Design an enzyme around this catalytic site. Sequence first.
Site, mmCIF file in Angstrom:
data_model
loop_
_atom_site.group_PDB
_atom_site.id
_atom_site.type_symbol
_atom_site.label_atom_id
_atom_site.label_comp_id
_atom_site.label_asym_id
_atom_site.label_seq_id
_atom_site.Cartn_x
_atom_site.Cartn_y
_atom_site.Cartn_z
ATOM 1 N N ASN A 193 0.905 -1.153 0.000
ATOM 2 C CA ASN A 193 0.000 0.000 0.000
ATOM 3 C C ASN A 193 0.936 1.193 0.000
ATOM 4 O OD1 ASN A 193 -2.537 1.060 2.464
ATOM 5 N ND2 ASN A 193 -2.477 1.496 0.256
ATOM 6 N N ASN A 242 -6.553 10.378 -0.543
ATOM 7 C CA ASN A 242 -6.587 9.179 -1.378
ATOM 8 C C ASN A 242 -6.188 9.560 -2.795
ATOM 9 O OD1 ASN A 242 -7.706 7.022 0.333
ATOM 10 N ND2 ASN A 242 -9.685 8.097 0.204
ATOM 11 N N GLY A 286 -3.896 3.073 8.365
ATOM 12 C CA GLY A 286 -2.959 2.337 9.189
ATOM 13 C C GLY A 286 -1.618 2.083 8.543
ATOM 14 N N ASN A 303 -12.669 5.522 9.714
ATOM 15 C CA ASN A 303 -13.207 5.378 8.370
ATOM 16 C C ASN A 303 -14.123 4.160 8.267
ATOM 17 O OD1 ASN A 303 -11.030 3.574 8.640
ATOM 18 N ND2 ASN A 303 -10.263 3.968 6.576
ATOM 19 N N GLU A 340 -10.704 -0.468 -1.784
ATOM 20 C CA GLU A 340 -10.735 0.714 -0.945
ATOM 21 C C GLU A 340 -11.537 1.847 -1.549
ATOM 22 O OE1 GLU A 340 -7.301 2.333 0.914
ATOM 23 O OE2 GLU A 340 -6.212 0.408 0.918
ATOM 24 N N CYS A 342 -4.420 -3.011 3.571
ATOM 25 C CA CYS A 342 -5.131 -1.921 4.232
ATOM 26 C C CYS A 342 -5.114 -2.163 5.728
ATOM 27 C CB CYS A 342 -6.577 -1.760 3.723
ATOM 28 S SG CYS A 342 -7.351 -0.332 4.536
ATOM 29 N N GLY A 343 -4.449 -1.268 6.459
ATOM 30 C CA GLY A 343 -4.332 -1.444 7.886
ATOM 31 C C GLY A 343 -5.626 -1.221 8.635
ATOM 32 N N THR A 344 -6.329 -0.120 8.336
ATOM 33 C CA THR A 344 -7.633 0.057 8.984
ATOM 34 C C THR A 344 -8.556 -1.076 8.583
ATOM 35 O OG1 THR A 344 -8.364 1.615 7.249
ATOM 36 C CG2 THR A 344 -7.561 2.585 9.385
ATOM 37 N N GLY A 345 -8.472 -1.567 7.349
ATOM 38 C CA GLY A 345 -9.376 -2.634 6.926
ATOM 39 C C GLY A 345 -9.044 -3.972 7.586
HETATM 40 C C1 LIG Z 1 -4.117 3.761 3.952
HETATM 41 C C2 LIG Z 1 -5.262 2.816 4.231
HETATM 42 N N1 LIG Z 1 -5.357 1.832 3.137
HETATM 43 C C3 LIG Z 1 -6.611 3.549 4.451
HETATM 44 C C4 LIG Z 1 -6.796 4.648 3.397
HETATM 45 C C5 LIG Z 1 -8.154 5.356 3.508
HETATM 46 C C6 LIG Z 1 -9.271 4.598 2.779
HETATM 47 N N2 LIG Z 1 -8.943 4.504 1.360
HETATM 48 C C7 LIG Z 1 -10.564 5.400 3.006
HETATM 49 O O1 LIG Z 1 -10.968 6.171 2.099
HETATM 50 O O2 LIG Z 1 -11.105 5.275 4.125
HETATM 51 C C8 LIG Z 1 -4.946 2.048 5.505
HETATM 52 O O3 LIG Z 1 -3.894 1.368 5.474
HETATM 53 O O4 LIG Z 1 -5.692 2.056 6.546
#
Ligand SMILES: *C[C@](N)(CCC[C@H](N)C(=O)O)C(=O)O
Lengths: 279, 279
Positions: free
Chosen positions: B12, B65, B75, B163, B214, B223-226
């Site tokens: 990412n 983004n 994340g 998010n 995403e 994706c860390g938050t995911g």
């Molecule tokens: C960097 C990310 N992949 C989250 C990026 C934000 C999302 N694309 C959104 O719009 O909520 C991560 O690693 O959490």
Amino acid sequence: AIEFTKYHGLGNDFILIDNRASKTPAITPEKAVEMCDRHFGIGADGVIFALPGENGTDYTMRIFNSDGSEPEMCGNGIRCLAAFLADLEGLSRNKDTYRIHTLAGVITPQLTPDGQIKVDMGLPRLLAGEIPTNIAAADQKVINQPLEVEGKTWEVTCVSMGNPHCITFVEDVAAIPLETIGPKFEHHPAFPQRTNTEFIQVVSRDYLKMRVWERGAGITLACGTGACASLVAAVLTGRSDRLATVELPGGPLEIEWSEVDQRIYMTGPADRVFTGKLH
Amino acid sequence: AIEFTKYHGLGNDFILIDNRASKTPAITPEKAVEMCDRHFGIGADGVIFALPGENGTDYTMRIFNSDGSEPEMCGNGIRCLAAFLADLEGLSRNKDTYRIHTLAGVITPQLTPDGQIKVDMGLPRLLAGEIPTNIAAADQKVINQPLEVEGKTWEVTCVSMGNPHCITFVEDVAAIPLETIGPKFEHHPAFPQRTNTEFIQVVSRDYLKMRVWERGAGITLACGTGACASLVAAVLTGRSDRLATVELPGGPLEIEWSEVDQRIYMTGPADRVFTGKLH
Ligand SMILES: *C[C@](N)(CCC[C@H](N)C(=O)O)C(=O)O
Ligand SMILES: *C[C@](N)(CCC[C@H](N)C(=O)O)C(=O)O
């Protein structure tokens, strides 16, 4: 420790390396794959080396595709390389044209007044043995010939610009499922060295719309050799005149198959994006 | 005139900008779109700004983004930002953790001895009104609820890490036609601010395989938050324990929903790829 400059020609994007210190490219094909990786590396369709001149030329070009393979020519890349060479020479530059040794032969870009670059791409090669393809005998042309791809029979024309091209004419190029069918042309057994594959919609006798699946690079936004080859195929099949615009996803190229010398001339832009250094 | 460093967290990938000189981001969202373009720009999933601290924090993170929209947290990007801040501080660094202000609240990465970064990602937000989604009433959770996408009903669980996430459990995640179905979830009317969408194959109670479409970025390699939201959803649905590896296309993250403080902790790598300057 590797310094580079990112360029694109109509969105066909390249990592340019100043390799004037040695005839040996300073990165291996394997490292070029890593550098071209869009997420883990720099991200490009290929790496282009500005190398010492050979046999009277000003400079030499070698290129690696993003899969590490080494093709014989690249038109968008020659335009980017001419722009890069002019940037390297700066106020020492004393001419508007470079003679560039490539695996395909000598290629001559000219930096024109309006910022575009016009390239003498050489003679198209039309015999099957020069493509190479096994669709016809080695000493025959390949014009509107059949190619069965997953049971569907396509009409194709093959032309080489130093590299192989397989050109097919379609009613609606935007409707081609390119991600699926592209690789099946690329790796078709009829092509012993693989092929680039162009899908062409004739808008008029001087305007072609093209999408491409490139050998070793996949879907690209533009292909200079492929636009040249497609114009040649359109002339050979009676569909177009010898001067046309080829509209690619990244923008237009002007292609001329000269009746004076039978060489192809390709004119388009080159854009410097950023300079960088690998960590 | 813009200097930047390219990083990725498990593929990412991000453009990091040292923005400590001002609270105003150095680039607009429109320019971020241009810079994130893979062929015409630098190429990234987002632009991340290292900004001055607010309200006691050490620094602030804002992120655009690749479509220009500004999400509330990231994340993989926090991990990259912590590594970037440590480089910017250099020998002046006097601690292993940073308190970072984000739109989602304070987020605290810790640089751990082995080169990984462990992040306190805060409390998961489980109410429909916090996602936001209209699948349930604003004061209700969203666990194994129906979502019709193009006439097929999926079972989905929603979780926010600042998010929005929409998680669905599948038997074979490699088989999901992610390019086709992903945007249909992202823009589903049930999500007024869009959503990120995670498809999860449970391998065991401590090992999840994830693919993600995403919001604002498309198919990403991690994706860390995911991954955090997916572990929460797996716990909420009884499918996994509170400590698990989440295997993403780019590699693994270690996620813990702590029983001590009910916060999520995410550990993974950050890699500096190259530094550069826009032409
Ligand atoms: C960097 C990310 N992949 C989250 C990026 C934000 C999302 N694309 C959104 O719009 O909520 C991560 O690693 O959490
Ligand atoms: C640069 C290129 N798109 C040709 C690149 C070589 C092909 N991928 C091949 O393998 O032959 C061009 O602009 O001509």
